[PDB]
């Protein structure tokens with residue numbers, strides 16, 4: 001799907017996690033955030049249409065998602081142990097990874 | 107060392123990076139920031155296995171990751187790009203300050 | 208491609224890096240390993256074919272590749288800066304990631 | 314602390330995890346390993362005293378601790394979820410990273 005649709009699925013499910021009641025709701029939100037981030041992996045962003053797939057910048061771009069996928073998995077792991085407090089706070093801490101890619105490429 | 111001392115090192119060296127002219131200065135400072143962060147990991151700010159303390163420790167884990175990626179750039183001589191990465195660290199410094207400072 | 212084929216590629220290109228005499232061999236080999244690790248990420252290994260796609264084991268197994276893809280990219284980045292020796296060394300260090308996965312799921 | 318000391322901390326605490334019976338022991342042992350690895354990251358080993366701090370050998374030396382820290386972090390993740398057996402098995406798999414650094418630099 002589109003990068004915007006993935007960025008919407010990321011932004012939406014983050015607020016789902018913030019306002020959730022339990023680990024199942026958190027989990028399925030993280031599972032959807034994960035699938036969306038791995039789907040936006042291939043996208044060329046508007047601000048780098050003048051760079052090739054194997055350029056330094058597109059490696060750095062794709063690496064920003066590698067970081068995000070990893071953190072989602074750490075959070076998701078916390079949800080699967082029934083640690084909802086901690087998972088919710090881990091999800092919160094993604095914000096600076098989201099932010100860091102935007103400060104460079106959004 | 108003490109928690110104030112780790113924060114000082116982190117703050118001091120973030121400035122050294124801001125005003126640096128070369129990759130060696132920037133490496134040196136990132137390296138010292140990595141050490142202070144891989145140190146401050148195991149302190150308590152004003153239960154150890156509480157949800158708060160995990161998340162306190164987790165903040166330093168995330169910060170260590172970003173310092174290490176900045177080091178990647180500085181080790182590759184990409185000095186400007188390392189300095190921007192270093193500027194973006196503030197988000198994590200701040201986000202933890204908002205919480206538990 | 209098949210999981211076995213991804214694994215030959217990984218093993219073959221790892222020995223190419225070991226024996227390389229120039230920067231292009233290491234870079235090219237690291238590029239082919241990155242692609243093969245990415246492709247293999249979604250595969251289901253024989254020993255977990257009767258597990259759910261959302262089992263803890265399939266998350267662990269998927270994560271093992273997340274680790275590997277990360278080290279491959281670290282090494283590739285080093286090679287792209289002319290730190291080819293460091294990249295060859297990094298490639299050798301992959302072996303414990305290869306072994307960690309095999310131990311559990313091969 | 315001294316490098317030998319950090320190694321002594323790594324070795325003793327690994328043995329503690331192997332023969333543990335609860336999560337608290339495992340978490341605490343891994344925490345001493347992390348701190349030992351952190352502190353050891355900055356050291357210069359006897360065999361690389363005759364090299365530049367920016368040498369491939371020293372870069373690769375530091376990297377071995379980076380890999381090890383990452384594996385300790387994961388083991389710590391399993392231990393926090395009371396997945397004691399799995400954390401003990403992840404701890405065992407650290408020995409590959411130990412051995413790989415020793416074979417080169419010890």
Ligand code: HEC
Pocket residue numbers: 003004007008010011014045046061062063064065068094095097098099101102105106
């Ligand atoms: C790259 C490494 C990114 C990561 C990781 C995240 N985002 Fe993103 N985002 C990125 C780009 C390049 C863009 C621009 C999209 C475009 O087509 O111009 C975005 C955009 C967004 C948006 C706005 C989408 C829109 O329709 O205007 C949002 C709301 C957004 N991003 C949210 C978001 C969140 C919540 C993330 C992590 C939790 C995240 N992004 C990560 C690049 C990258």
Ligand code: HEC
Pocket residue numbers: 109110113114116117120151152161162163164165166169195196198199200202203206207
């Ligand atoms: C937790 C996850 C933290 C991260 C990451 C960073 N900081 Fe920190 N910082 C933290 C706490 C709990 C406190 C309060 C400590 C106290 O006893 O007052 C601080 C404080 C500081 C300070 C002020 C220290 C003082 O003597 O008053 C500074 C200057 C500071 N922190 C800087 C800093 C920088 C530069 C960081 C990242 C680059 C950073 N901190 C991260 C907790 C955490």
Ligand code: HEC
Pocket residue numbers: 210211214215217218221252253268269270271272275301302304305306308309312313
């Ligand atoms: C999971 C997280 C894996 C990682 C990372 C690596 N390997 Fe792998 N490998 C894995 C599985 C499940 C299997 C069994 C495949 C099967 O269908 O039986 C393998 C197999 C191999 C093989 C042998 C293939 C065969 O003919 O039986 C080799 C040579 C191999 N793997 C090499 C290899 C290398 C070099 C890796 C990292 C550098 C590596 N593997 C990582 C699972 C995983």
Ligand code: HEC
Pocket residue numbers: 316317320321323324327358359374375376377378381407408410411412414415418419
């Ligand atoms: C480098 C990247 C290392 C990693 C990772 C590990 N070890 Fe280590 N170890 C390393 C060096 C260079 C040395 C030699 C130190 C010296 O002064 O000679 C060692 C030594 C040890 C020792 C011997 C202690 C002594 O008194 O000399 C032990 C017991 C030891 N190392 C244990 C150990 C363990 C358990 C690790 C993982 C579990 C490990 N090491 C990783 C370098 C590195």
Ligand code: NA
Pocket residue numbers: 110
């Ligand atoms: Na003071």
Ligand code: NA
Pocket residue numbers: 256257
């Ligand atoms: Na089946």
